[PDB]
């Protein structure tokens, strides 16, 4: 029926947490913090406190990351990269094309005012803006070959100057192109020249792309203008047990078992209702406000725990309204059918416990 009083109850649900981000079993997580994922991978100038970190349990990001891409542009296939970067155990940053002796015929000291650091203009740390020297922009063709049984992430960019006078003063050509070819890839980008509204006081744009090499494959670059050549790459090493979580909680030094975007949980109660998104081996999520069983129960919780055993909630582009509504329909259904299964079991589990002792009294009555 309605709310009732019972002698001994154990609330499976838990609605209390320390409320602090902390260590997950002993490995400190990556803390992007004041910087975004797109800014971090490209090596934003004000994002240089994470160059040393190369091992994590999960990745954090503030709700409104202030600065990422310092130079305005459109990161192509952004939402797909976050999915591939969620399950990376640890990578290794190596200089794929050394600045000293990989571009000896061009100019590599190119900076812009929109990426100022300490009051001085700079650029990214994982990219190299090429420009002609002496008045010539020679044909470039650089090849790479991955031969170490590890996928390699490669990023580059294409430049779209605001007008035409800009182009011939940098690359000395009218119709440039950039070609990237692999064993299972092919593209041919061309610059687009038009006037755009100012963003960050710049009328130009730079589109950033990426590709994921495979062991034994070869990637070949070719361009005669408007190329932002790579300087560093990443040797990925896929793993499990991580993800992107948006949070603003302070950091602290403890040792928990799992993590939720609002805190960590140290308890053995089978259920929780703080948040469905979590990382680690820790209790499920039930949308009820109060769940209890009159004290069977240990087997009851584990009976439906196995069936329930990520809800990542992958971000979608602004032009994918059909996707998000499709995923919102899926996510809400699974979290509402499952909370009703556990709610109904309590009405059935507690009811059996009543006559379980009453029949004993009748059995005692016979005896």
């Amino acid at each position, epitope marked *: 029926e309605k709310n009732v009083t019972v002698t001994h109850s154990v609330n499976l649900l838990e609605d209390s947490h320390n409320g602090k981000l902390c260590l997950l079993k002993g490995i400190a997580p990556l803390q992007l913090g004041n910087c975004s994922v797109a800014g971090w991978i490209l090596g934003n100038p004000e994002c240089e406190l994470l160059i040393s970190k190369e091992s994590w349990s999960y990745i954090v990001e503030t709700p409104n990351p202030e600065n990422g891409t310092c130079y305005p542009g459109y990161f192509a296939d952004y939402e797909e990269l976050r999915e591939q970067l969620s399950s990376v155990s640890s990578f*290794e940053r*190596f*200089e794929i094309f*050394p600045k*000293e*002796s*990989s571009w*000896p015929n061009h100019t590599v000291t190119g900076v812009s005012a929109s990426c100022s650091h300490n009051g001085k203009s700079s650029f990214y740390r994982n990219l190299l803006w090429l420009t002609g020297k002496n008045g010539l922009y020679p044909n470039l063709s*650089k*090849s*790479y*070959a991955n*031969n*170490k049984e*590890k996928e390699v992430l490669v990023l580059w960019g294409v430049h779209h100057p605001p007008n035409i006078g800009d182009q011939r003063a940098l690359y000395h050509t009218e119709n440039a192109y950039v070609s990237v070819v692999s064993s299972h890839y092919s593209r041919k980008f061309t610059p687009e020249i038009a006037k755009r509204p100012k963003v960050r006081d710049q009328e130009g744009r730079i589109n950033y792309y990426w590709t994921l090499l495979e062991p034994g494959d*070869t990637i070949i670059f070719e361009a005669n203008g408007n190329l932002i050549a790579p300087r560093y790459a990443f*040797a990925l090493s896929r793993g499990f047990g991580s993800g992107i979580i948006t949070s603003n909680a302070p950091m602290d030094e403890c040792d928990a078992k799992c993590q939720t975007p609002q805190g960590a949980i140290n308890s053995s109660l089978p259920f929780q209702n703080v948040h469905p998104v979590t990382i680690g081996e820790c209790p499920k999520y039930v949308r009820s406000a109060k769940l209890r069983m009159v004290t069977i129960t240990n087997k009851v919780n584990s009976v439906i725990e196995k069936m329930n055993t990520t809800a990542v909630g992958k971000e979608f582009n602004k032009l994918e309204r059909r996707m998000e509504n499709l995923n919102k329909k899926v996510d809400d259904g699974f979290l509402d059918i499952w909370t009703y299964n556990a709610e109904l079991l309590v009405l059935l589990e507690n009811e059996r416990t009543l006559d379980f002792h009453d029949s004993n009294v009748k059995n005692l009555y016979e005896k």
Partner: antibody
Amino acid sequence: EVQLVESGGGLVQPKGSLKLSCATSGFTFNTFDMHWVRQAPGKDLEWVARIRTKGNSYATYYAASVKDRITISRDDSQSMLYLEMNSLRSEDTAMYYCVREGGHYYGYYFDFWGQGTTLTV
Amino acid sequence: IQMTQTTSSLSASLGDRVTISCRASQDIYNYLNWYQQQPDGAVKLLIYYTSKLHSGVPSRFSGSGSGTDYSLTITNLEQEDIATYFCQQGYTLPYTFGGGTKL
């Protein structure tokens, strides 16, 4: 620092089994894959056989001509690499080296070498 | 697969700019390391990849080149830097060393 001391070299007849040995100091033996390089007088440097770490089930790869005559093992607990030879030949008088690979994604580069032992027949 | 080299020996002054080249038979995708051999002693590694540097090596050692034609350049050579150098691939399994050059 990183020193490599080796011993076991001497004179033998072309039927014996001289087991060479090498020792290490200054790092962890469980995260590096080491090699074996020999140099005969008047002959350029060559390669013999490579032993990987536990990340490849202690896989062992061998040169072409040397194959079917040599075997290597890793004494991780004692941190002394040891090699055993058999079926010698008169074209195997050479100075032997204890080498370390080094873990970074710039291929294989063999950054640390030993003093070298003299084996003659 | 097979590595040639420059002449076996070179005569160097004190203050010269000595270069040595190590051209490969096939194409090694920019994996050409260098080594130094002190006389009556062990050997040391100078450069890996193509133009990177090893910790504890002076700043007057540097390389260049790509494809199947690499080089090593020494500037303001001293009297201590006398040894024999080689070149080694890192591409495929039968790692090939060099023919040796004496300074």
